[PDB]
Amino acid sequence: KEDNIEMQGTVLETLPNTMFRVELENGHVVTAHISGKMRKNYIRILTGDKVTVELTPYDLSKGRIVFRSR
Amino acid sequence: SMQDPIADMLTRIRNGQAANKAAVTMPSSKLKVAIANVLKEEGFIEDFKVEGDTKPELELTLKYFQGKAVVESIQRVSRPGLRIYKRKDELPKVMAGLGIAVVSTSKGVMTDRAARQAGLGGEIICYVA
Amino acid sequence: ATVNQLVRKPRARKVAKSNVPALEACPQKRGVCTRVYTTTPKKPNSALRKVCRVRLTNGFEVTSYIGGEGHNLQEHSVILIRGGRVKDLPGVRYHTVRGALDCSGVKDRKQARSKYGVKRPKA
RNA sequence: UAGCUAGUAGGUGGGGUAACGGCUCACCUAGGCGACGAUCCCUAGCUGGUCUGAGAGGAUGACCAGCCACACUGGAACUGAGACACGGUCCAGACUCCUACGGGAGGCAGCAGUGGGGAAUAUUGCACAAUGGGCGCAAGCCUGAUGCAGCCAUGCCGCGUG
RNA sequence: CCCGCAGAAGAAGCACCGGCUAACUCCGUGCCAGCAGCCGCGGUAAUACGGAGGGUGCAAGCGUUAAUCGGAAUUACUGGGCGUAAAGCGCACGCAGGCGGUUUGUUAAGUCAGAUGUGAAAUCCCCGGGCUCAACCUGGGAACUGCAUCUGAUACUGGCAAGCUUGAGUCUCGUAGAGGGGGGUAGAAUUCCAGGUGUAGCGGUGAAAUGCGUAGAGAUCUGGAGGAAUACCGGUGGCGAAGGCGGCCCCCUGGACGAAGACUGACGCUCAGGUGCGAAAGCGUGGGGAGCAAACAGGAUUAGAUACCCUGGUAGUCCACGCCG
RNA sequence: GGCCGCAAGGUUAAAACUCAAAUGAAUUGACGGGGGC
RNA sequence: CUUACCACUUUGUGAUUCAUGACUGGGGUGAAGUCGUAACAAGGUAACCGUAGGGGAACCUGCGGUUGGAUCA
Ligand SMILES: NC(=O)OC[C@@H](O)C[C@H](NC(=O)[C@H]1NCCC[C@H]1O)C(=O)N[C@@H](Cc1c[nH]cn1)C(=O)N[C@H](C(=O)O)[C@H](O)c1c[nH]c(Cl)n1
Ligand SMILES: [K+]
Ligand SMILES: [Mg+2]
Ligand SMILES: [Mg+2]
Ligand SMILES: [Mg+2]
Ligand SMILES: [Mg+2]
Ligand SMILES: [Mg+2]
Ligand SMILES: [Mg+2]
Ligand SMILES: [Mg+2]
Ligand SMILES: [Mg+2]
Ligand SMILES: [Mg+2]
Ligand SMILES: [Mg+2]
Ligand SMILES: [Mg+2]
Ligand SMILES: [Mg+2]
Ligand SMILES: [Mg+2]
Ligand SMILES: [Mg+2]
Ligand SMILES: [Mg+2]
Ligand SMILES: [Mg+2]
Ligand SMILES: [Mg+2]
Ligand SMILES: [Mg+2]
Ligand SMILES: [Mg+2]
Ligand SMILES: [Mg+2]
Ligand SMILES: [Mg+2]
Ligand SMILES: [Mg+2]
Ligand SMILES: [Mg+2]
Ligand SMILES: [Mg+2]
Ligand SMILES: [Mg+2]
Ligand SMILES: [Mg+2]
Ligand SMILES: [Mg+2]
Ligand SMILES: [Mg+2]
Ligand SMILES: [Mg+2]
Ligand SMILES: [Mg+2]
Ligand SMILES: [Mg+2]
Ligand SMILES: [Mg+2]
Ligand SMILES: [Mg+2]
Ligand SMILES: [Mg+2]
Ligand SMILES: [Mg+2]
Ligand SMILES: [Mg+2]
Ligand SMILES: [Mg+2]
Ligand SMILES: [Mg+2]
Ligand SMILES: [Mg+2]
Ligand SMILES: [Mg+2]
Ligand SMILES: [Mg+2]
Ligand SMILES: [Mg+2]
Ligand SMILES: [Mg+2]
Ligand SMILES: [Mg+2]
Ligand SMILES: [Mg+2]
Ligand SMILES: [Mg+2]
Ligand SMILES: [Mg+2]
Ligand SMILES: [Mg+2]
Ligand SMILES: [Mg+2]
Ligand SMILES: [Mg+2]
Ligand SMILES: [Mg+2]
Ligand SMILES: [Mg+2]
Ligand SMILES: [Mg+2]
């Protein structure tokens, strides 16, 4: 959390367990899982959207989605 | 088959008590007579009797104090599948001693009190209570 | 079971098992952190958790938790591990000992210091 | 892991041991062991005791005492009352060291101590004043046994920080 | 070990505070970062995360990890279970083995009593003594439940001998039965074939189609062939160790039950290994083949329909001898 | 792995690993292309 | 000098076991993959057991058995 990393990306394909494959503005692909409120707000994500992706410096291969472009 | 007559005697007394019968009868045997005498002199039964020469029958007359059986627990110990012997130092106490335990001494059959008074061990036939 | 059947074949004690086999009954073991990464918990809880893959001195590979806020580990750092499970993470059976060998103590902790290898702050 | 055993089980006569014995050899008999587990495989020094439990039981064999076995690995014997012998001998083997390359030397699982392994385990100390042991007529010599000191909150017990 | 000197003068930390479990509030934080033995906590007022104030528990220590026992009656000897929660072999026969009805005599192995020897010291427990107390050391006793021998006891179990009829078995007289094996035979019905009449539809479905018919179907009458199963009695029934057993007659054969009497004299119950029987499907060799009917062909249904539905149809179903279990 | 079988297979019979359950009986409601008035 | 017994050793042969290992097989976990609706009510063809054949799957059909099946209209 300290010194967080903030990026956008595009979701490419659906995975089981509501996890997702997202290409990143820098060319990298990451594995993403949903946050609580867009889970609590019943907001479902489809293929192809632009999404805001939080990253952590410990590992950049997997991130978390926090905001989807409708 | 019938492989344990004393256990049979005990169960007959127990069922007869539960069924509020005045008396029960079963084929006699000298060992059964000895056990029955021991019970009678301790006050668990009213009287006992034997009749017939060719095939004698042993009769026990049960006792009810307040409409409920005086005998309220009988268990065989030293059953044929597993024999039990105790020394003088170990003769047990049943119901903390309000009850009795029949033991066969070289001297014969007698309660645990008598057996430890005489200073004998023996085989534990049954607990009564 | 009738007495005869027990004489022929006695009772059997239920054989016990240890849930930290890699320790081999030692209280701690040394190992090299071949891989450092972060995983996700199970259904009820959501978080990203720090974890490591380590090769012990006795030949095993195991996955161990890195407690506390922030760590300094590397793909070849040397650490001391101890028994302990992480309930959420599946297949994690061990904990890293903070403030021992290369694993440094949590910075600026001020309560429960002994559990994180932090020295009494001078005043 | 259901069969095992031919010196295998007995007997007679030589031989051999401090001593009984297939202990060994010649001959004869055809036995002997096993479901009450022989044979085979894996694992293990044994006991007084220790920890736990109300008890029956369960786990265990560090310290101290008794018994057993081993002394780099394998084979053998001599000397001796007693060894097939930790600081003795011969042979074989691996390793280390010396060499004029002709051959030679060595065995800390004794007390300190070193490298290595490991989460982790002490000083290359003082005395033979006390107890015990070897030699000696005795004086006495020898003794890393033993007595004591050093290091470590490892444990138990007592005390202070007013 | 004793005496004197200075000055409080040289000497306090670790964990925890949502429930089990002793101890709560503010500020950060927003299911994030993080905690965790379990029950779980964290998405805008968190006594559960991080800091602070306060409090609780231990104290020269305090916590975590490792390992054993306990709680766990959760391997149940003391002290558990098997109709449906896990747990009665598919059924029967039987060797070793386990247990045994009733009386008398004898024996003394089990069993009970006494004595002797032994059970190293240390350890444990009890009562005292010495270190300023304590840890620690130490004197006496208890204990070491065990083993061995000698002398006695004779109720019970065991051995030996001889009895007994109540368990078990044999004989005579009757009764019921789809119990089993072999050989004959009767009736109704589907299919096929021949013949007469007859005339163009039949069959099938939720609706259809595939299919069959002038070479004469379907319908109706007469004769012949072949195979398989027993209308109705029929049960709320019976027989069998279990699987299972149904037209009628004959032959060979097992078991069960009732009456009264006679005979043997415990001759018994159970059973690890072992040996037999064991629906249907299936395998091998050789026959048979009406009705069915996996596979498969064709017609439909549906979005699809490798199915349910419709027209056909092979193995099999049947017989003899082996196998499977 | 052993034994049996022409073959299909039968019989004897484990562990790693993983979860905090799985299960039996019965209770009150909802539901049925289940009944009855 | 020579004979017997014999460790160690070298060959060949077998057995047994550890390490790995090209590869092949299946098993467990899954909060918003895909494709169907097989089961729970008469789950819309009552379910299940043994056995044989067949199909992308959850399954379908033949033979025999059980009720751990609803209605008896
Ligand atoms: N996608 C797909 O598979 O098809 C759709 C499916 O829903 C059809 C449905 N079919 C059924 O129920 C089966 N039930 C068993 C027998 C055969 C069949 O009937 C059906 O609706 N049937 C109707 C008639 C029909 C119309 N279209 C196709 N079939 C029907 O009559 N069903 C009957 C009923 O409702 O009980 C029954 O099924 C039946 C009796 N006789 C016949 Cl034929 N069918
Ligand atoms: K007679
Ligand atoms: Mg010979
Ligand atoms: Mg001789
Ligand atoms: Mg001689
Ligand atoms: Mg060893
Ligand atoms: Mg207990
Ligand atoms: Mg106690
Ligand atoms: Mg020892
Ligand atoms: Mg032992
Ligand atoms: Mg040692
Ligand atoms: Mg030597
Ligand atoms: Mg020597
Ligand atoms: Mg020696
Ligand atoms: Mg030496
Ligand atoms: Mg040394
Ligand atoms: Mg060293
Ligand atoms: Mg090291
Ligand atoms: Mg001296
Ligand atoms: Mg010297
Ligand atoms: Mg010295
Ligand atoms: Mg100290
Ligand atoms: Mg002073
Ligand atoms: Mg002051
Ligand atoms: Mg409280
Ligand atoms: Mg905490
Ligand atoms: Mg707090
Ligand atoms: Mg907590
Ligand atoms: Mg504080
Ligand atoms: Mg217990
Ligand atoms: Mg139970
Ligand atoms: Mg069930
Ligand atoms: Mg069951
Ligand atoms: Mg049965
Ligand atoms: Mg069977
Ligand atoms: Mg017998
Ligand atoms: Mg008897
Ligand atoms: Mg005796
Ligand atoms: Mg005695
Ligand atoms: Mg002693
Ligand atoms: Mg005192
Ligand atoms: Mg003492
Ligand atoms: Mg004494
Ligand atoms: Mg007798
Ligand atoms: Mg039409
Ligand atoms: Mg015609
Ligand atoms: Mg019957
Ligand atoms: Mg007959
Ligand atoms: Mg007799
Ligand atoms: Mg059997
Ligand atoms: Mg058949
Ligand atoms: Mg058809
Ligand atoms: Mg129910
Ligand atoms: Mg359905
Ligand atoms: Mg096909």
How many other β-carbons are positioned within 10 Å of the β-carbon of residue B22? 10
CA distance linking residue C120 with residue C123, whole number of Å? 9
Residue A38, nucleotide of least CA–C1' distance: E43
To 5 degrees, how large is the angle CA C35–CA A63–CA C91? Answer: 45
Strand D contact nucleotides, protein CB < 7 Å: 36, 58-59, 117-120
Name all domains of chain B by residue range, CATH numbers in brackets. 5-69 (3.30.1370.30), 74-128 (3.30.1490.10)
Q: Please tell me what resolution, in angstroms, this structure has.
A: 3.2
**Residue closest to B107 by CA, chosen among B95, B118, B92:** B118
- Residues paired with C51 in a beta bridge: C37, C65
Quick one: which residue's CA is nearest to D58's C1'? C13
CA distance to partner chain C, nearest, from residue A45 (Å): 18
Q: Exposed/middle/buried for C33, CB within 10 Å: 0-12, 13-18, 19+?
A: buried
Token digits for A18? Answer: 């509501």
Q: Which residues are within 8 A (CB) of A38 and not within 5 positions of it... i.e. 6 or more apart?
A: A65, A66, A67, A68
Solved with = cryo-EM
CA of C33 to C1' of D16 (A): 72
- Residue reference for tokens 């410990």: A58
CA of B32 to C1' of D50 (A): 52
**Residue closest to C21 by CA, chosen among C91, C88, C100, C89:** C91
Chain C residues whose CB is inside 8 A of the B81 CB are 2-4
Strand F contact nucleotides, protein CB < 7 Å: 16-19
In Å, how far from its chain's centre is CA A30? 8
Overall residue count recorded for chain B in this entry: 129
Chain C residues whose CB is inside 8 A of the A35 CB are 46
Chain C residues whose CB is inside 8 A of the A36 CB are 46
Q: Which sign does the torsion angle of CA A36, A38, A40, A42 carry?
A: negative
Task: Tell me which residue in C37, C40, C50 faces A33 most closely, judged by beta carbons.
Answer: C40
Token digits for C46? Answer: 């959501």
- Residues paired with B59 in a beta bridge: B25, B49
Token digits for C69? Answer: 């806020």
Which subunits sit against A, judged by 3+ Cβ pairs under 8 A?
A: C
To 5 degrees, how large is the angle CA C88–CA C80–CA C35? Answer: 60
Do residues C96 and C81 touch, judged by C-beta distance below 8 A?
A: yes
Distance C99 CA to ligand 23 centre (A): 46
To 5 degrees, how large is the angle CA A15–CA A12–CA C45? Answer: 40
In chain A, the residue whose alpha carbon lies closest to the alpha carbon of C37 is A59
CA distance linking residue B95 with residue B127, whole number of Å? 9
Residue C13, nucleotide of least CA–C1' distance: E75
Distance C3 CA to ligand 10 centre (A): 27
User: Per the CATH hierarchy, to which homologous superfamily does domain C1-123 belong?
Assistant: Nucleic acid-binding proteins (2.40.50.140)
Do residues A20 and A13 touch, judged by C-beta distance below 8 A?
A: yes
CA distance to partner chain C, nearest, from residue A68 (Å): 19
CA distance linking residue C85 with residue C47, whole number of Å? 17
Distance A42 CA to ligand 42 centre (A): 81
b/e burial code for range A4-40 (CB count within 10 A of at least 16 → b): eeebebbbeeeeeeeebbbebeeeeebebbbbeeeee
Q: Which residues are within 8 A (CB) of B43 and not within 5 positions of it... i.e. 6 or more apart?
A: B63, B70
**Residue closest to A9 by CA, chosen among A58, A55, A59:** A55
B81: contact with C, CB 8 A cutoff:
yes
- Residue reference for tokens 């407690």: C67
A52 residue type, one letter: T
Q: Which residues are within 8 A (CB) of B102 and not within 5 positions of it... i.e. 6 or more apart?
A: B35, B38, B39, B109, B110, B111, B124, B125, B126, B128
CA distance linking residue C73 with residue C33, whole number of Å? 8
